[PDB]
Amino acid sequence: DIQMTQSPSSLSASVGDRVTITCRSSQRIMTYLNWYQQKPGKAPKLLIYVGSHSQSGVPSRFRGSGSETDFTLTISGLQPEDSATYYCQQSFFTPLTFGGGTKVEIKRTVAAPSVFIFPPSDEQLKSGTASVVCLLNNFYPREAKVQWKVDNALQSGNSQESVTEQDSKDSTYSLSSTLTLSKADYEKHKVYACEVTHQGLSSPVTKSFNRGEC
Amino acid sequence: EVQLQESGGGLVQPGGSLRLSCAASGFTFSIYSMNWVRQAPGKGLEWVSSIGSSGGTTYYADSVKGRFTISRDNSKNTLYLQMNSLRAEDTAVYYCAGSQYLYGMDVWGQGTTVTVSSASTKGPSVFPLAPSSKSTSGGTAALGCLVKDYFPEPVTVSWNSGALTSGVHTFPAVLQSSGLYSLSSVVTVPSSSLGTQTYICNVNHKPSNTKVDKRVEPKSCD
Protein backbone atom coordinates (compact mmCIF):
# COMPACT_ATOMS: atom_id res chain seq x y z
CA ASP A 1 0.00 0.00 0.00
CA ILE A 2 1.78 3.10 -1.29
CA GLN A 3 1.44 5.84 1.32
CA MET A 4 1.20 9.40 -0.01
CA THR A 5 2.69 12.15 2.17
CA GLN A 6 1.27 15.58 1.29
CA SER A 7 2.75 18.79 2.73
CA PRO A 8 1.88 21.35 3.99
CA SER A 9 -1.50 20.46 5.51
CA SER A 10 -2.55 24.09 5.04
CA LEU A 11 -1.23 27.39 3.73
CA SER A 12 -2.34 31.01 3.42
CA ALA A 13 -1.05 33.07 0.49
CA SER A 14 -2.15 36.32 -1.10
CA VAL A 15 -3.64 36.79 -4.55
CA GLY A 16 -0.87 36.83 -7.14
CA ASP A 17 1.49 34.80 -4.95
CA ARG A 18 3.16 31.52 -5.94
CA VAL A 19 2.46 28.53 -3.68
CA THR A 20 3.80 24.98 -3.87
CA ILE A 21 2.19 21.75 -2.67
CA THR A 22 4.38 18.66 -2.34
CA CYS A 23 3.38 14.99 -2.41
CA ARG A 24 5.72 12.13 -1.51
CA SER A 25 5.17 8.42 -2.13
CA SER A 26 6.60 5.66 0.06
CA GLN A 27 7.52 3.80 -3.15
CA ARG A 28 8.50 4.79 -6.67
CA ILE A 29 5.45 5.39 -8.87
CA MET A 30 7.26 6.77 -11.92
CA THR A 31 5.05 9.66 -13.10
CA TYR A 32 1.62 8.21 -12.22
CA LEU A 33 0.50 10.93 -9.81
CA ASN A 34 -2.63 13.03 -10.26
CA TRP A 35 -3.74 16.27 -8.59
CA TYR A 36 -7.34 17.15 -7.75
CA GLN A 37 -9.05 20.33 -6.56
CA GLN A 38 -12.12 20.25 -4.32
CA LYS A 39 -13.93 23.51 -3.70
CA PRO A 40 -16.30 23.78 -0.72
CA GLY A 41 -19.47 21.83 -1.40
CA LYS A 42 -18.31 20.61 -4.82
CA ALA A 43 -17.07 17.28 -6.12
CA PRO A 44 -13.34 16.86 -6.83
CA LYS A 45 -11.99 18.07 -10.17
CA LEU A 46 -8.91 16.83 -12.02
CA LEU A 47 -6.14 19.39 -12.48
CA ILE A 48 -3.00 17.42 -13.42
CA TYR A 49 -2.77 13.81 -14.62
CA VAL A 50 0.32 11.60 -14.86
CA GLY A 51 2.62 14.10 -13.18
CA SER A 52 2.63 17.13 -15.46
CA HIS A 53 -0.21 16.78 -17.99
CA SER A 54 -3.14 19.20 -17.93
CA GLN A 55 -6.17 19.84 -20.12
CA SER A 56 -6.70 23.02 -22.12
CA GLY A 57 -8.91 24.83 -19.64
CA VAL A 58 -6.82 24.20 -16.55
CA PRO A 59 -5.32 27.66 -15.85
CA SER A 60 -1.67 28.07 -16.80
CA ARG A 61 -1.00 28.76 -13.11
CA PHE A 62 -1.69 25.08 -12.32
CA ARG A 63 1.52 23.17 -13.12
CA GLY A 64 2.58 19.72 -11.92
CA SER A 65 6.07 18.23 -11.84
CA GLY A 66 8.16 15.46 -10.34
CA SER A 67 8.89 11.78 -10.75
CA GLU A 68 9.72 8.65 -8.76
CA THR A 69 8.84 9.70 -5.19
CA ASP A 70 8.83 13.53 -5.16
CA PHE A 71 6.03 15.51 -6.83
CA THR A 72 4.93 19.13 -6.70
CA LEU A 73 1.86 21.19 -7.60
CA THR A 74 2.65 24.87 -8.13
CA ILE A 75 -0.01 27.59 -8.36
CA SER A 76 1.71 30.64 -9.88
CA GLY A 77 -0.62 33.62 -9.62
CA LEU A 78 -3.11 32.61 -6.95
CA GLN A 79 -6.71 33.62 -7.60
CA PRO A 80 -9.65 33.96 -5.18
CA GLU A 81 -11.40 30.96 -6.75
CA ASP A 82 -8.30 28.87 -5.96
CA SER A 83 -9.45 28.72 -2.33
CA ALA A 84 -10.01 24.97 -2.02
CA THR A 85 -8.53 21.67 -0.86
CA TYR A 86 -6.02 19.91 -3.11
CA TYR A 87 -5.23 16.19 -3.13
CA CYS A 88 -2.61 14.04 -4.82
CA GLN A 89 -3.38 10.49 -5.91
CA GLN A 90 -1.08 7.72 -7.11
CA SER A 91 -2.40 5.77 -10.10
CA PHE A 92 0.45 3.22 -10.11
CA PHE A 93 -0.91 0.06 -8.46
CA THR A 94 -3.70 -0.89 -6.09
CA PRO A 95 -4.80 -0.02 -3.49
CA LEU A 96 -5.12 3.48 -4.96
CA THR A 97 -4.11 5.97 -2.27
CA PHE A 98 -4.80 9.68 -1.84
CA GLY A 99 -2.77 12.28 -0.02
CA GLY A 100 -4.14 13.81 3.16
CA GLY A 101 -5.06 17.04 1.38
CA THR A 102 -3.84 20.64 1.53
CA LYS A 103 -6.17 23.52 2.40
CA VAL A 104 -5.28 26.69 0.46
CA GLU A 105 -6.52 29.92 2.04
CA ILE A 106 -6.39 33.24 0.18
CA LYS A 107 -4.66 35.90 2.29
CA ARG A 108 -6.48 39.17 1.56
CA THR A 109 -6.70 42.60 3.16
CA VAL A 110 -8.48 43.05 6.47
CA ALA A 111 -12.27 43.28 6.19
CA ALA A 112 -14.52 44.03 9.15
CA PRO A 113 -17.73 42.04 9.64
CA SER A 114 -21.20 43.43 9.12
CA VAL A 115 -23.10 42.45 12.26
CA PHE A 116 -26.79 41.51 12.45
CA ILE A 117 -28.92 40.23 15.33
CA PHE A 118 -32.17 38.26 15.01
CA PRO A 119 -34.71 37.77 17.82
CA PRO A 120 -36.43 34.40 18.22
CA SER A 121 -39.54 33.98 16.11
CA ASP A 122 -42.95 33.73 17.73
CA GLU A 123 -43.30 30.32 16.07
CA GLN A 124 -40.25 28.92 17.86
CA LEU A 125 -41.38 30.38 21.19
CA LYS A 126 -44.53 28.23 20.97
CA SER A 127 -42.16 25.25 21.30
CA GLY A 128 -40.78 26.51 24.62
CA THR A 129 -37.30 27.38 23.34
CA ALA A 130 -35.69 30.58 22.06
CA SER A 131 -32.75 30.81 19.65
CA VAL A 132 -31.05 34.21 19.30
CA VAL A 133 -28.78 34.51 16.27
CA CYS A 134 -25.93 36.98 15.73
CA LEU A 135 -24.49 37.09 12.20
CA LEU A 136 -21.03 38.37 11.26
CA ASN A 137 -20.96 38.78 7.48
CA ASN A 138 -18.02 39.01 5.06
CA PHE A 139 -14.93 39.51 7.21
CA TYR A 140 -11.25 38.55 7.18
CA PRO A 141 -9.20 37.16 8.88
CA ARG A 142 -11.19 34.31 10.44
CA GLU A 143 -10.30 35.37 14.00
CA ALA A 144 -13.31 37.03 15.62
CA LYS A 145 -14.76 37.31 19.12
CA VAL A 146 -18.54 37.21 19.65
CA GLN A 147 -19.81 37.80 23.18
CA TRP A 148 -23.46 37.61 24.23
CA LYS A 149 -25.05 39.80 26.89
CA VAL A 150 -28.54 39.38 28.36
CA ASP A 151 -29.58 42.29 30.59
CA ASN A 152 -25.85 43.07 30.90
CA ALA A 153 -25.27 39.46 32.04
CA LEU A 154 -22.12 38.09 30.40
CA GLN A 155 -23.11 34.82 28.72
CA SER A 156 -20.76 31.83 28.67
CA GLY A 157 -21.26 28.23 27.57
CA ASN A 158 -24.76 28.63 26.07
CA SER A 159 -23.79 29.67 22.52
CA GLN A 160 -22.52 27.77 19.48
CA GLU A 161 -20.59 29.15 16.51
CA SER A 162 -20.49 28.08 12.88
CA VAL A 163 -18.20 29.51 10.20
CA THR A 164 -18.54 29.18 6.45
CA GLU A 165 -15.72 28.14 4.17
CA GLN A 166 -13.84 31.02 2.57
CA ASP A 167 -15.79 32.71 -0.21
CA SER A 168 -14.51 31.97 -3.71
CA LYS A 169 -14.99 35.55 -4.97
CA ASP A 170 -14.20 37.95 -2.10
CA SER A 171 -12.15 35.55 0.09
CA THR A 172 -14.14 36.45 3.23
CA TYR A 173 -15.76 34.42 5.99
CA SER A 174 -19.16 34.59 7.63
CA LEU A 175 -19.94 33.46 11.16
CA SER A 176 -23.17 32.62 12.98
CA SER A 177 -23.44 32.58 16.77
CA THR A 178 -26.62 31.08 18.22
CA LEU A 179 -27.62 31.70 21.83
CA THR A 180 -30.05 29.08 23.16
CA LEU A 181 -32.41 29.78 26.06
CA SER A 182 -35.70 28.41 27.27
CA LYS A 183 -38.81 30.49 26.63
CA ALA A 184 -39.21 31.03 30.38
CA ASP A 185 -35.67 32.38 30.70
CA TYR A 186 -36.02 34.42 27.51
CA GLU A 187 -39.15 36.07 28.95
CA LYS A 188 -37.36 37.04 32.18
CA HIS A 189 -35.02 39.50 30.41
CA LYS A 190 -35.33 42.44 28.03
CA VAL A 191 -32.01 43.43 26.41
CA TYR A 192 -30.27 40.91 24.14
CA ALA A 193 -26.97 42.04 22.65
CA CYS A 194 -24.07 40.51 20.73
CA GLU A 195 -20.76 42.40 20.82
CA VAL A 196 -18.19 41.70 18.10
CA THR A 197 -14.44 42.34 18.25
CA HIS A 198 -12.34 42.07 15.09
CA GLN A 199 -9.08 43.53 13.81
CA GLY A 200 -10.98 45.42 11.10
CA LEU A 201 -13.13 47.38 13.55
CA SER A 202 -11.73 50.48 15.25
CA SER A 203 -13.44 49.22 18.42
CA PRO A 204 -16.03 46.57 19.32
CA VAL A 205 -19.44 46.81 17.64
CA THR A 206 -22.63 45.89 19.50
CA LYS A 207 -26.00 44.95 18.01
CA SER A 208 -29.00 44.45 20.27
CA PHE A 209 -32.77 44.21 20.44
CA ASN A 210 -35.36 44.46 23.20
CA ARG A 211 -37.79 41.59 23.72
CA GLY A 212 -41.44 42.37 23.07
CA GLU A 213 -40.58 45.45 20.97
CA CYS A 214 -41.68 44.50 17.46
CA GLU B 1 -19.60 17.15 -22.31
CA VAL B 2 -18.18 14.19 -20.38
CA GLN B 3 -20.62 13.57 -17.54
CA LEU B 4 -21.26 11.10 -14.72
CA GLN B 5 -24.61 11.12 -12.89
CA GLU B 6 -24.89 9.16 -9.65
CA SER B 7 -27.95 8.04 -7.66
CA GLY B 8 -29.06 5.48 -5.08
CA GLY B 9 -27.77 7.07 -1.88
CA GLY B 10 -29.78 7.31 1.30
CA LEU B 11 -30.08 6.26 4.93
CA VAL B 12 -29.44 2.58 5.67
CA GLN B 13 -29.50 0.43 8.79
CA PRO B 14 -26.27 -1.27 9.93
CA GLY B 15 -25.90 -4.62 8.20
CA GLY B 16 -28.27 -3.58 5.42
CA SER B 17 -27.61 -3.31 1.70
CA LEU B 18 -27.63 -0.49 -0.84
CA ARG B 19 -26.82 -0.27 -4.55
CA LEU B 20 -25.36 2.88 -6.10
CA SER B 21 -25.55 3.75 -9.80
CA CYS B 22 -23.57 6.04 -12.09
CA ALA B 23 -24.70 6.87 -15.63
CA ALA B 24 -22.11 7.94 -18.19
CA SER B 25 -22.43 10.11 -21.29
CA GLY B 26 -20.14 12.02 -23.63
CA PHE B 27 -17.37 9.45 -24.12
CA THR B 28 -16.68 5.85 -25.10
CA PHE B 29 -17.61 4.22 -21.80
CA SER B 30 -16.21 0.86 -22.93
CA ILE B 31 -12.62 2.20 -22.97
CA TYR B 32 -12.83 3.95 -19.58
CA SER B 33 -11.77 2.34 -16.33
CA MET B 34 -14.13 3.31 -13.52
CA ASN B 35 -13.71 3.80 -9.78
CA TRP B 36 -15.65 4.60 -6.64
CA VAL B 37 -14.24 7.13 -4.16
CA ARG B 38 -15.80 8.23 -0.87
CA GLN B 39 -15.36 11.14 1.53
CA ALA B 40 -16.35 10.79 5.17
CA PRO B 41 -17.86 13.93 6.74
CA GLY B 42 -15.03 16.42 7.14
CA LYS B 43 -12.39 13.91 6.01
CA GLY B 44 -10.26 13.39 2.92
CA LEU B 45 -10.81 11.33 -0.20
CA GLU B 46 -10.67 7.54 0.16
CA TRP B 47 -10.53 5.03 -2.68
CA VAL B 48 -13.23 2.34 -2.57
CA SER B 49 -13.04 0.14 -5.68
CA SER B 50 -11.85 -0.02 -9.28
CA ILE B 51 -13.08 -1.88 -12.36
CA GLY B 52 -11.44 -2.40 -15.74
CA SER B 53 -12.96 -0.98 -18.90
CA SER B 54 -14.21 -4.45 -19.88
CA GLY B 55 -15.35 -5.47 -16.39
CA GLY B 56 -13.03 -8.48 -16.22
CA THR B 57 -10.90 -6.91 -13.47
CA THR B 58 -11.98 -5.50 -10.11
CA TYR B 59 -10.09 -4.08 -7.13
CA TYR B 60 -11.24 -3.22 -3.62
CA ALA B 61 -9.98 -1.43 -0.54
CA ASP B 62 -9.22 -3.67 2.42
CA SER B 63 -11.99 -2.01 4.46
CA VAL B 64 -14.75 -3.03 2.02
CA LYS B 65 -13.49 -6.32 0.56
CA GLY B 66 -16.15 -9.03 0.57
CA ARG B 67 -18.91 -6.51 1.36
CA PHE B 68 -18.85 -4.22 -1.70
CA THR B 69 -19.06 -5.37 -5.32
CA ILE B 70 -18.27 -3.10 -8.27
CA SER B 71 -19.81 -3.91 -11.65
CA ARG B 72 -20.60 -2.25 -14.96
CA ASP B 73 -22.85 -2.65 -18.00
CA ASN B 74 -21.13 -1.18 -21.04
CA SER B 75 -24.32 -1.65 -23.07
CA LYS B 76 -26.11 0.83 -20.77
CA ASN B 77 -23.14 3.11 -19.97
CA THR B 78 -23.77 2.44 -16.28
CA LEU B 79 -21.54 1.72 -13.28
CA TYR B 80 -22.79 0.11 -10.07
CA LEU B 81 -21.62 -0.36 -6.49
CA GLN B 82 -23.43 -3.04 -4.48
CA MET B 83 -22.82 -2.32 -0.78
CA ASN B 84 -23.78 -5.15 1.59
CA SER B 85 -23.23 -5.67 5.32
CA LEU B 86 -23.03 -1.91 5.66
CA ARG B 87 -21.23 -0.45 8.67
CA ALA B 88 -21.46 2.90 10.44
CA GLU B 89 -17.95 3.80 9.25
CA ASP B 90 -19.16 3.43 5.64
CA THR B 91 -21.05 6.72 6.04
CA ALA B 92 -19.73 9.20 3.48
CA VAL B 93 -20.39 10.90 0.17
CA TYR B 94 -19.65 8.41 -2.62
CA TYR B 95 -18.26 9.49 -6.01
CA CYS B 96 -17.87 7.60 -9.27
CA ALA B 97 -14.93 8.57 -11.46
CA GLY B 98 -13.11 7.14 -14.46
CA SER B 99 -10.61 7.78 -17.22
CA GLN B 100 -9.11 6.25 -20.34
CA TYR B 101 -5.93 5.93 -18.23
CA LEU B 102 -5.90 3.01 -15.81
CA TYR B 103 -6.58 4.11 -12.21
CA GLY B 104 -7.05 7.71 -13.35
CA MET B 105 -10.07 9.87 -12.48
CA ASP B 106 -10.62 12.47 -15.20
CA VAL B 107 -14.44 12.70 -15.10
CA TRP B 108 -16.25 12.86 -11.75
CA GLY B 109 -19.87 12.58 -10.73
CA GLN B 110 -21.60 15.07 -8.46
CA GLY B 111 -21.72 12.62 -5.55
CA THR B 112 -24.38 10.85 -3.50
CA THR B 113 -24.69 10.63 0.28
CA VAL B 114 -24.85 7.32 2.16
CA THR B 115 -25.67 7.29 5.88
CA VAL B 116 -25.42 4.10 7.94
CA SER B 117 -27.15 4.60 11.30
CA SER B 118 -29.67 2.87 13.54
CA ALA B 119 -31.00 6.27 14.63
CA SER B 120 -34.37 7.60 13.47
CA THR B 121 -34.58 10.09 10.61
CA LYS B 122 -36.18 13.35 11.77
CA GLY B 123 -37.18 16.40 9.74
CA PRO B 124 -36.17 19.92 10.76
CA SER B 125 -38.22 22.76 12.15
CA VAL B 126 -37.84 25.89 9.99
CA PHE B 127 -38.04 29.24 11.78
CA PRO B 128 -37.69 32.76 10.34
CA LEU B 129 -34.76 35.06 11.04
CA ALA B 130 -35.86 38.69 10.69
CA PRO B 131 -34.82 41.88 12.49
CA SER B 132 -37.00 44.00 14.73
CA SER B 133 -38.10 47.48 13.68
CA LYS B 134 -35.32 49.28 15.58
CA SER B 135 -32.45 47.38 13.94
CA THR B 136 -29.51 49.69 13.19
CA SER B 137 -28.60 48.37 9.74
CA GLY B 138 -27.46 50.73 7.01
CA GLY B 139 -28.34 50.22 3.36
CA THR B 140 -27.91 46.45 3.73
CA ALA B 141 -30.11 44.17 5.83
CA ALA B 142 -30.07 40.44 6.53
CA LEU B 143 -32.78 37.78 6.59
CA GLY B 144 -32.57 34.04 7.06
CA CYS B 145 -34.10 30.78 8.16
CA LEU B 146 -33.17 28.59 11.12
CA VAL B 147 -33.24 24.88 10.23
CA LYS B 148 -33.29 23.14 13.59
CA ASP B 149 -33.26 19.57 14.92
CA TYR B 150 -32.93 17.20 11.98
CA PHE B 151 -31.09 13.94 11.39
CA PRO B 152 -29.17 12.78 9.42
CA GLU B 153 -27.20 15.11 7.20
CA PRO B 154 -27.64 16.65 4.66
CA VAL B 155 -30.26 19.34 4.06
CA THR B 156 -30.53 21.62 1.03
CA VAL B 157 -31.52 25.28 1.42
CA SER B 158 -32.33 27.67 -1.43
CA TRP B 159 -34.01 31.07 -1.64
CA ASN B 160 -36.89 32.07 -3.92
CA SER B 161 -36.59 28.65 -5.61
CA GLY B 162 -33.00 29.33 -6.66
CA ALA B 163 -33.78 32.73 -8.17
CA LEU B 164 -31.91 34.41 -5.27
CA THR B 165 -28.30 33.26 -4.91
CA SER B 166 -26.18 36.39 -4.50
CA GLY B 167 -25.38 37.09 -0.86
CA VAL B 168 -26.62 33.73 0.44
CA HIS B 169 -24.67 31.95 3.19
CA THR B 170 -25.86 28.52 4.37
CA PHE B 171 -23.70 27.72 7.38
CA PRO B 172 -22.25 24.29 8.21
CA ALA B 173 -24.55 22.25 10.41
CA VAL B 174 -23.63 21.85 14.08
CA LEU B 175 -24.30 18.58 15.93
CA GLN B 176 -26.28 19.49 19.03
CA SER B 177 -26.09 17.57 22.30
CA SER B 178 -29.38 15.90 21.32
CA GLY B 179 -27.67 14.16 18.41
CA LEU B 180 -29.68 16.35 16.02
CA TYR B 181 -28.30 18.90 13.57
CA SER B 182 -28.99 22.63 13.33
CA LEU B 183 -27.93 25.35 10.91
CA SER B 184 -28.88 28.82 9.71
CA SER B 185 -29.15 30.15 6.16
CA VAL B 186 -28.92 33.91 5.69
CA VAL B 187 -29.05 36.37 2.80
CA THR B 188 -28.14 40.06 2.73
CA VAL B 189 -30.46 42.37 0.78
CA PRO B 190 -31.08 46.11 0.43
CA SER B 191 -32.70 47.52 3.56
CA SER B 192 -35.58 49.17 1.69
CA SER B 193 -36.49 45.77 0.20
CA LEU B 194 -36.74 44.08 3.61
CA GLY B 195 -40.35 44.96 4.40
CA THR B 196 -41.79 44.66 0.88
CA GLN B 197 -40.08 42.12 -1.36
CA THR B 198 -40.79 38.39 -1.18
CA TYR B 199 -38.09 36.22 0.41
CA ILE B 200 -38.80 32.49 0.74
CA CYS B 201 -36.34 29.90 2.06
CA ASN B 202 -36.79 26.47 0.47
CA VAL B 203 -35.67 23.64 2.77
CA ASN B 204 -35.48 20.00 1.67
CA HIS B 205 -34.55 17.09 3.95
CA LYS B 206 -34.78 13.99 1.76
CA PRO B 207 -34.12 11.32 4.45
CA SER B 208 -37.22 12.31 6.46
CA ASN B 209 -39.15 13.52 3.37
CA THR B 210 -39.53 16.99 4.92
CA LYS B 211 -39.77 19.89 2.46
CA VAL B 212 -40.76 23.41 3.51
CA ASP B 213 -41.12 26.82 1.85
CA LYS B 214 -41.07 29.52 4.55
CA ARG B 215 -41.73 33.19 3.83
CA VAL B 216 -39.49 35.42 5.96
CA GLU B 217 -40.55 38.98 6.75
CA PRO B 218 -40.26 41.39 9.69
CA LYS B 219 -42.86 41.46 12.44
CA SER B 220 -45.89 43.70 11.98
CA CYS B 221 -44.97 47.14 13.38
CA ASP B 222 -47.54 49.88 12.79
Residue numbers in the entry:
A (entry chain B): 1 to 214
B (entry chain A): 1 to 222
Sentences from the paper on this structure:
The antibodies described in the present study target the oxidized macrophage migration inhibitory factor (oxMIF), the activated and disease related isoform of the macrophage migration inhibitory factor (MIF). MIF to oxMIF conversion exposes hidden epitopes within the compact MIF homo-trimer, enabling specific binding of anti-oxMIF antibodies. However, this study revealed that imalumab exhibits an unusually short half-life of only 2.3–7.3 days (56–176 h) in humans and showed a non-linear pharmacokinetic (PK) dose relationship, indicating some intrinsic limitations of this first-generation anti-oxMIF antibody. By combining in silico analysis with experimental validation, we identified surface hydrophobicity and aggregation propensity as the underlying causes of the unusually short half-life of the first generation anti-oxMIF antibody imalumab.
To assess the impact of the specified point mutations (LC: F49Y/A51G/W93F; HC: L5Q/W97Y) on the overall structure, the Fab region of C0083 was recombinantly expressed, purified, and crystallized. Despite the overall similarity, the H:CDR3 of C0083 was completely restructured due to the mutation H:W97Y, while the L:CDR3 containing the mutation L:W93F did not differ substantially from imalumab. However, the L:W93F mutation in L:CDR3 facilitates an interaction between L:F93 and L:I2, which are now approximately 3 Å apart. This interaction led to a significant decrease in the solvent-accessible surface area (SASA) of L:F93 (C0083, L:F93: 70.9 Å2 vs. imalumab, L:W93: 157.0 Å2), resulting in reduced exposure of this hydrophobic amino acid. In the completely restructured H:CDR3, H:Y97 adopted a new conformation and occupied the space originally taken by H:Y99 in the parent Fab. The altered loop conformation enabled an interaction between H:Y97 and L:Y49, and significantly shifted the position of H:Y99. With only minimal modifications compared to imalumab, it maintained specificity and affinity for oxMIF in the low nanomolar range while exhibiting significantly reduced hydrophobicity and aggregation potential due to the H:L5Q/W97Y and L:F49Y/W93F mutations. Additionally, the L:A51G mutation reduced immunogenicity by eliminating a high-affinity T-cell epitope. The structural analysis of C0083 Fab employing X-ray crystallography demonstrated that the reorganization of the heavy chain CDR3 loop was a crucial factor in the observed enhancement of biophysicochemical characteristics.
